[PDB]
Design a protein around this ligand. Structure first.
Ligand SMILES: Cc1nnc(-c2cccc(Br)c2)o1
Length: 209
């Protein structure tokens, strides 16, 4: 049972700008997604400080990077607070309408796409490298859901029958054919060391057979 939603017009515009603008520095997508994971991990850690049972769904707080060259996917997994269904529908827990407004004014007033995270909409930088993005998520207060979009103005939400997650979020980037450098170990390592060296959670780069 799959529900299809229209993006708000401002978010559709943000996504088309990310997809259509010539902009070579695409690697910042990974920094933005790792920073989102770190923010989600901070949230569940804060909640556990007064309620240890918040970690009954998993005590470990970490980030995994899982490249799969056969599927042409890069998956970013975290065990943060996760998202409810309502969060997913409401722009993946962001204030994306006001964030997009600010970001697009900054762009005409000097800034560049790499600055997107300062506007709270860094998730959408996934579309610098991905033709499709699938988000699997589990929040303590809701069931496991899958969000998905290939842009084009719409996204879907469904209950996820896949492998149960415990708690957290999995961002599956279905990479564009010309963006497969981001599945190579040495490239991913380079980007994490350049842009994510001060993230306060373990980041494990899985290797492939
Ligand atoms: C708003 C807004 N105006 N241009 C952009 C943009 C262009 C290329 C890459 C990225 Br990320 C963002 O965002």
């Amino acid at each position: 049972e799959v529900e299809t939603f229209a993006f708000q017009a401002e978010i559709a515009q943000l996504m088309s700008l990310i997809i259509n603008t010539f902009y070579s520095n695409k690697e910042i997508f990974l920094r933005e997604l790792i920073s989102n994971s770190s923010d989600a991990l901070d949230k569940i850690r804060y909640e556990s400080l007064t309620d240890p049972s918040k970690l009954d769904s998993g005590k470990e707080l970490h980030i995994n990077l899982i490249p799969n060259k056969q599927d042409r996917t890069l998956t970013i997994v975290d065990t943060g607070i996760g998202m409810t269904k309502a969060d997913l529908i409401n722009n993946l827990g962001t204030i994306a309408k006001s964030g997009t407004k600010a970001f697009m004014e900054a762009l005409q007033a000097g800034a560049d796409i790499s600055m997107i995270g300062q506007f709270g909409v860094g998730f959408y930088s996934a579309y610098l490298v991905a033709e499709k993005v699938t988000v699997i998520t589990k929040h303590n207060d809701d069931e496991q859901y899958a969000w998905e979009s290939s842009a084009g103005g719409s996204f879907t939400v469904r209950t996820d029958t896949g492998e149960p997650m415990g708690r957290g979020t999995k961002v599956i980037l279905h990479l564009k054919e010309d963006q497969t450098e981001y599945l190579e170990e040495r490239r991913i390592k380079e980007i994490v060391k350049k842009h994510s060296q001060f993230i306060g959670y373990p980041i494990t780069l899985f290797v492939e057979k």
